[PDB]
PDB file of C-alpha atoms and ligand atoms in Angstrom:
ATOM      1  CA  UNK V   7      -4.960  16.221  26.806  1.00 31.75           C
ATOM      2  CA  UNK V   8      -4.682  13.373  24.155  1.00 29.06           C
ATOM      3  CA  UNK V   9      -3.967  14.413  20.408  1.00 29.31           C
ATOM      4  CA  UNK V  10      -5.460  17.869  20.470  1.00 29.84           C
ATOM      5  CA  UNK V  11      -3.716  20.103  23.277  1.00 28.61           C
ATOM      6  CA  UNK V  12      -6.635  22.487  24.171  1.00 30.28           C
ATOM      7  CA  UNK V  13      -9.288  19.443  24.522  1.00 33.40           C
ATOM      8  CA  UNK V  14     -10.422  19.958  28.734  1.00 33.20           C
ATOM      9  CA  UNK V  15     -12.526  17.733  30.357  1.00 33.81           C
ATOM     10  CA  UNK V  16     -14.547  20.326  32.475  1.00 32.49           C
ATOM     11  CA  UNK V  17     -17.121  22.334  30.636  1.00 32.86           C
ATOM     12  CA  UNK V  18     -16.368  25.563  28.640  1.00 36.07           C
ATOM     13  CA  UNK V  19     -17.902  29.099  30.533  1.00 33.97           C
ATOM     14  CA  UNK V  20     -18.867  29.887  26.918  1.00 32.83           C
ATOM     15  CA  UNK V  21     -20.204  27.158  24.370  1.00 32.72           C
ATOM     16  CA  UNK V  22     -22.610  27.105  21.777  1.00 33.05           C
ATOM     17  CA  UNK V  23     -23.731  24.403  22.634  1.00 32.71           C
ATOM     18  CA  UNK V  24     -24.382  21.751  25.016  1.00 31.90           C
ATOM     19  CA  UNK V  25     -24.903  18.316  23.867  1.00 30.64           C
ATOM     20  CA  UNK V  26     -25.342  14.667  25.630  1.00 31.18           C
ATOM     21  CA  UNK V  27     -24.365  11.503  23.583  1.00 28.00           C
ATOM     22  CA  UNK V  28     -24.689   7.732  23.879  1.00 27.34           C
ATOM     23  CA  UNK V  29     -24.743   4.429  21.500  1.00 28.00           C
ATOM     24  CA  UNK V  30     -27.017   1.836  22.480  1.00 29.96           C
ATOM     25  CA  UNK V  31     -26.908  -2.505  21.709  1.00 28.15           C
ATOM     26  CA  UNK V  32     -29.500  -4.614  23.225  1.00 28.70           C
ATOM     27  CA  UNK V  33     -30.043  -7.940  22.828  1.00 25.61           C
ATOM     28  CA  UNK V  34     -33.374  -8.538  21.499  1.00 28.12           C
ATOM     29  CA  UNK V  35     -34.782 -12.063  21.473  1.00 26.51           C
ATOM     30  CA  UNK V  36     -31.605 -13.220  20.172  1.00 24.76           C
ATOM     31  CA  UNK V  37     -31.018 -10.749  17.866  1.00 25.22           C
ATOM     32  CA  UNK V  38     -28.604  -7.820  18.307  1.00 26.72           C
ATOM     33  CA  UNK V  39     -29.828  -4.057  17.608  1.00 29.05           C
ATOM     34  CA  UNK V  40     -28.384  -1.024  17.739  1.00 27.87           C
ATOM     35  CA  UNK V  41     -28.390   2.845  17.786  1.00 27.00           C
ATOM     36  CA  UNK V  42     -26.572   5.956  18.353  1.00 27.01           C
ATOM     37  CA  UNK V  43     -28.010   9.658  19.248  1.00 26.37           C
ATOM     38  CA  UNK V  44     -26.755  13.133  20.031  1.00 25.04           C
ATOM     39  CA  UNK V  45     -29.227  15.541  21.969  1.00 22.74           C
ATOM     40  CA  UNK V  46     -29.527  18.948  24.286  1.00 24.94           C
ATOM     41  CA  UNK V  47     -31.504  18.581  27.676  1.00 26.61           C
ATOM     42  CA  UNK V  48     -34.613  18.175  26.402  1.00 25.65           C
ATOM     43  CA  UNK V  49     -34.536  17.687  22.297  1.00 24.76           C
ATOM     44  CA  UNK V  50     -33.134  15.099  20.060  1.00 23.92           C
ATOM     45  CA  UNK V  51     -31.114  16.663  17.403  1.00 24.04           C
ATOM     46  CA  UNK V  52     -29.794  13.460  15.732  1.00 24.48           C
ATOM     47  CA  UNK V  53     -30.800   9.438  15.964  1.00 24.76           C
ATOM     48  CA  UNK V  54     -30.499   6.347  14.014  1.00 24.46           C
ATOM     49  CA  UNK V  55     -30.109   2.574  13.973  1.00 26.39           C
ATOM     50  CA  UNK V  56     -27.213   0.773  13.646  1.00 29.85           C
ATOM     51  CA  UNK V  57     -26.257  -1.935  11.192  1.00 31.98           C
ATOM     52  CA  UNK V  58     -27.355  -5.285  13.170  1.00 27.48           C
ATOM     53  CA  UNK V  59     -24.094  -6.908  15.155  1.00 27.44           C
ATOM     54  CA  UNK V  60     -22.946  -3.234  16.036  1.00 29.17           C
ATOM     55  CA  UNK V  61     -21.663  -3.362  19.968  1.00 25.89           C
ATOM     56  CA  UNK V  62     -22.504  -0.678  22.920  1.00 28.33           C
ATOM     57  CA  UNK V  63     -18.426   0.459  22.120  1.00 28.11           C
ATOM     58  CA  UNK V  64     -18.827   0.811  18.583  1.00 29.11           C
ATOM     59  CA  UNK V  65     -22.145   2.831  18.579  1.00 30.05           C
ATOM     60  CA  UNK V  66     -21.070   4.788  21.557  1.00 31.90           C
ATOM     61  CA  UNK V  67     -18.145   6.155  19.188  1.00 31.81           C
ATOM     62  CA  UNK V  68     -20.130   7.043  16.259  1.00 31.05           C
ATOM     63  CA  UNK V  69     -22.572   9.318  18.548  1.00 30.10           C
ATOM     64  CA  UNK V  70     -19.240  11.254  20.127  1.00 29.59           C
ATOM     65  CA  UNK V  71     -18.239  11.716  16.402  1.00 28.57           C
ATOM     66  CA  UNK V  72     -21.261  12.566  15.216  1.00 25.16           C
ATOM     67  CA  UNK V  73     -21.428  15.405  17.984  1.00 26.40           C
ATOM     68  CA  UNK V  74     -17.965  16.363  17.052  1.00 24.68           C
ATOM     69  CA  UNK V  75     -18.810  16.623  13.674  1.00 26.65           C
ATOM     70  CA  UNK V  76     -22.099  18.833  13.697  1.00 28.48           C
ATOM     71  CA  UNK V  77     -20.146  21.280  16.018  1.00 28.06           C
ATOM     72  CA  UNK V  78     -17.504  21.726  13.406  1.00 30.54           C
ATOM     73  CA  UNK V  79     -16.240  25.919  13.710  1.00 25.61           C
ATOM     74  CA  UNK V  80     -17.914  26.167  17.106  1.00 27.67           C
ATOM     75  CA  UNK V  81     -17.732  26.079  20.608  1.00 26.40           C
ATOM     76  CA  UNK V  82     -18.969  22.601  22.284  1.00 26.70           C
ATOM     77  CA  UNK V  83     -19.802  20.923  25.744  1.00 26.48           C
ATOM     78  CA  UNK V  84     -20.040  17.567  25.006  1.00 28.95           C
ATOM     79  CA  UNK V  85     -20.922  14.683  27.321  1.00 30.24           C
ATOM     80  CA  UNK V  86     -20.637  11.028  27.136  1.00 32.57           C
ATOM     81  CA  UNK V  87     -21.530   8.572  29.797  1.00 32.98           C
ATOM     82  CA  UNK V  88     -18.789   6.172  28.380  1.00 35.74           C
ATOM     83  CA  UNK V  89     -15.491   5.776  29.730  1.00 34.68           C
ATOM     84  CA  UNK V  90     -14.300   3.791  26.848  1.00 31.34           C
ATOM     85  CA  UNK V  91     -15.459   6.709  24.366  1.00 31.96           C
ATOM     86  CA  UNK V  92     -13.912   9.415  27.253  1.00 32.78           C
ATOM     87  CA  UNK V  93     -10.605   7.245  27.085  1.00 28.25           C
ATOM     88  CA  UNK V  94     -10.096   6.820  23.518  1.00 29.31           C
ATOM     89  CA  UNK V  95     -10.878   9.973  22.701  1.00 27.54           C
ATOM     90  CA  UNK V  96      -7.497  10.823  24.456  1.00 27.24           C
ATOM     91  CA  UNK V  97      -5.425   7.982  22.806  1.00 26.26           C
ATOM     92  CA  UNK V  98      -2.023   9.709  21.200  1.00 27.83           C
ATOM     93  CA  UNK V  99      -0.842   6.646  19.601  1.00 30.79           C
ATOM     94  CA  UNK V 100      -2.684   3.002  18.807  1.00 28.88           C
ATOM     95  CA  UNK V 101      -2.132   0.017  16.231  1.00 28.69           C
ATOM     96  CA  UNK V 102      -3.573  -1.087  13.809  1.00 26.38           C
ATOM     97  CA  UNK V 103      -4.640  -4.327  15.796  1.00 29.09           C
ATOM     98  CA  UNK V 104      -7.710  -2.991  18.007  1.00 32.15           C
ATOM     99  CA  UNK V 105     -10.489  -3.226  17.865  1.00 31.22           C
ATOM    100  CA  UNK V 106     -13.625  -0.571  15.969  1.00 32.80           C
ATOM    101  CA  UNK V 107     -10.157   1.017  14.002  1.00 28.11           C
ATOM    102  CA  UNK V 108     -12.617   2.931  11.401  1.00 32.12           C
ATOM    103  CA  UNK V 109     -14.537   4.302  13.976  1.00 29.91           C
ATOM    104  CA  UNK V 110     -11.767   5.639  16.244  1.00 30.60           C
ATOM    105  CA  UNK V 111     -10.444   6.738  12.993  1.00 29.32           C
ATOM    106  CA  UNK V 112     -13.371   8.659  12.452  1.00 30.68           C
ATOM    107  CA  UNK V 113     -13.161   9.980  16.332  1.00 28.07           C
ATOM    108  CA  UNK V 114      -9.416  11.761  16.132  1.00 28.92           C
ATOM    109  CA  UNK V 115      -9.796  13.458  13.093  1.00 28.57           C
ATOM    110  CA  UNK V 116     -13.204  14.944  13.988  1.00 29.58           C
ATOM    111  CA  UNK V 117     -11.574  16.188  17.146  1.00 28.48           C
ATOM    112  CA  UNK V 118     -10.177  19.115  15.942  1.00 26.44           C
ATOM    113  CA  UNK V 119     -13.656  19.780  14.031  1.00 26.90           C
ATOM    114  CA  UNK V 120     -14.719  22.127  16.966  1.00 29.92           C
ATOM    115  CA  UNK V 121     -13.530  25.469  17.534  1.00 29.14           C
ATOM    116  CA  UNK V 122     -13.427  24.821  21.168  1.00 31.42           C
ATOM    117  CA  UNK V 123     -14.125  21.322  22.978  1.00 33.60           C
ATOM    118  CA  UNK V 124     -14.407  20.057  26.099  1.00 36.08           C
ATOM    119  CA  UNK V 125     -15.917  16.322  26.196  1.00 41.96           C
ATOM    120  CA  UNK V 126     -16.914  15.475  30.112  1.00 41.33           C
ATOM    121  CA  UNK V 127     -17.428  12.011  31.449  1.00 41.88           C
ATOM    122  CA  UNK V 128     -20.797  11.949  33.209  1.00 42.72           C
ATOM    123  CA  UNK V 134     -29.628  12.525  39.795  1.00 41.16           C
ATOM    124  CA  UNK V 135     -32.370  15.471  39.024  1.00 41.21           C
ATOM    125  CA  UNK V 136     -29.847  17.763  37.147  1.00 39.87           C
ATOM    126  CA  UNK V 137     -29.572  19.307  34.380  1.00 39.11           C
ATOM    127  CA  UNK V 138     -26.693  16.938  32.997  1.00 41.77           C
ATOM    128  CA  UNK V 139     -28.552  13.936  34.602  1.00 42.72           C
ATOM    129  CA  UNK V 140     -31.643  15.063  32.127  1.00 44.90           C
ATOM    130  CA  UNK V 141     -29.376  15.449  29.327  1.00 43.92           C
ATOM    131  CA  UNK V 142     -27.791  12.254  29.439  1.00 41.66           C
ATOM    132  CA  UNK V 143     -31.009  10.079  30.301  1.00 41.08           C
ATOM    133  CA  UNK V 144     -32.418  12.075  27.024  1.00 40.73           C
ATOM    134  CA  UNK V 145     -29.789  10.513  24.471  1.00 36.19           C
ATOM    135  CA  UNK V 146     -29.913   7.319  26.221  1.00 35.38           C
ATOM    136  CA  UNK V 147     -33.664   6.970  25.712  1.00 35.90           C
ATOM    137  CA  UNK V 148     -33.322   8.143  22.038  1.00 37.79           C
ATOM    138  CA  UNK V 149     -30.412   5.471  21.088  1.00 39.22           C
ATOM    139  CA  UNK V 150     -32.434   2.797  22.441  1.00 40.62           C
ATOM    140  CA  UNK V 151     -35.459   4.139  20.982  1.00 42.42           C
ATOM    141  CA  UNK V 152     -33.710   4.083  17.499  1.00 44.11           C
ATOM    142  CA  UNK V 153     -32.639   0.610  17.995  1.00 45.28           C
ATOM    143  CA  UNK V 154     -35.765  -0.998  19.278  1.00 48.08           C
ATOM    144  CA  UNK V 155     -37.832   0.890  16.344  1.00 45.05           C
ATOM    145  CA  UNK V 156     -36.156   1.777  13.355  1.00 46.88           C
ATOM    146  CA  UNK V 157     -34.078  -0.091  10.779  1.00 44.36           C
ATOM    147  CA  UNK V 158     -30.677   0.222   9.874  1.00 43.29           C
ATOM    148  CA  UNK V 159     -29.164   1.686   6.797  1.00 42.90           C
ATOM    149  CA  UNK V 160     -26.940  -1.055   6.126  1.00 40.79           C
ATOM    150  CA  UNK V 161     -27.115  -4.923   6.320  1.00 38.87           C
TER     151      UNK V 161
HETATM  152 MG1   MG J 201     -23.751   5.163  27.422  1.00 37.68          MG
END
């Protein structure tokens, strides 16, 4: 499925880990803010702001990377409430002319990071926890921290 062959959507029986990501951009009063975080259930492993002007689509690529990324040589469950993220993530061919191009850059060559992947696409759960965890963490980076750049 997309450019890496083994990539599944449903989860792995075996991972070493089970992560939840999201990117965050809220308007506030006018001005536009921005964050991005990868956690487990319960714990926030990774968070920061965004560069001010960053959209919801850009951020929510640079947490599925950064996931990606950190799981480098290892077996990972990764989940992403985005469909755009879900969808690009099995692009096999693009243009230069589209839009965030150095992020999904970023995005197809950390695919094959992982030793094993499987990113999934979305309650009281487990996963419902997990995914109102790294949505509460992006936001919380973007409301009260500052960006590295600009
Ligand atoms: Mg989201």
């Amino acid at each position: 499925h997309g450019t890496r062959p083994d990539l599944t959507d449903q989860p792995l029986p075996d991972a070493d880990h089970t992560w939840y990501t999201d990117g965050s951009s809220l308007l506030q009063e006018g001005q536009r803010k921005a964050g991005a975080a990868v956690t487990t259930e319960t714990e926030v492993i990774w968070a920061k702001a965004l560069p001010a002007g960053t959209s919801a689509q850009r951020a929510e690529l640079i947490a599925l990377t950064q996931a990606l990324k950190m799981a480098e040589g290892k077996k990972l469950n990764v989940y992403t409430d985005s469909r755009y993220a879900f969808a690009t993530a099995h692009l096999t061919s693009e243009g230069k002319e589209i839009k965030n191009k150095d992020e999904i850059l970023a995005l197809l060559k950390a695919l094959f990071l992982p030793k094993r992947l499987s990113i999934i696409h979305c309650g009281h759960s487990a996963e419902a926890r997990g995914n109102r965890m790294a949505d509460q963490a992006a936001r919380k980076a973007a409301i009260t921290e500052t960006p590295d750049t600009s």
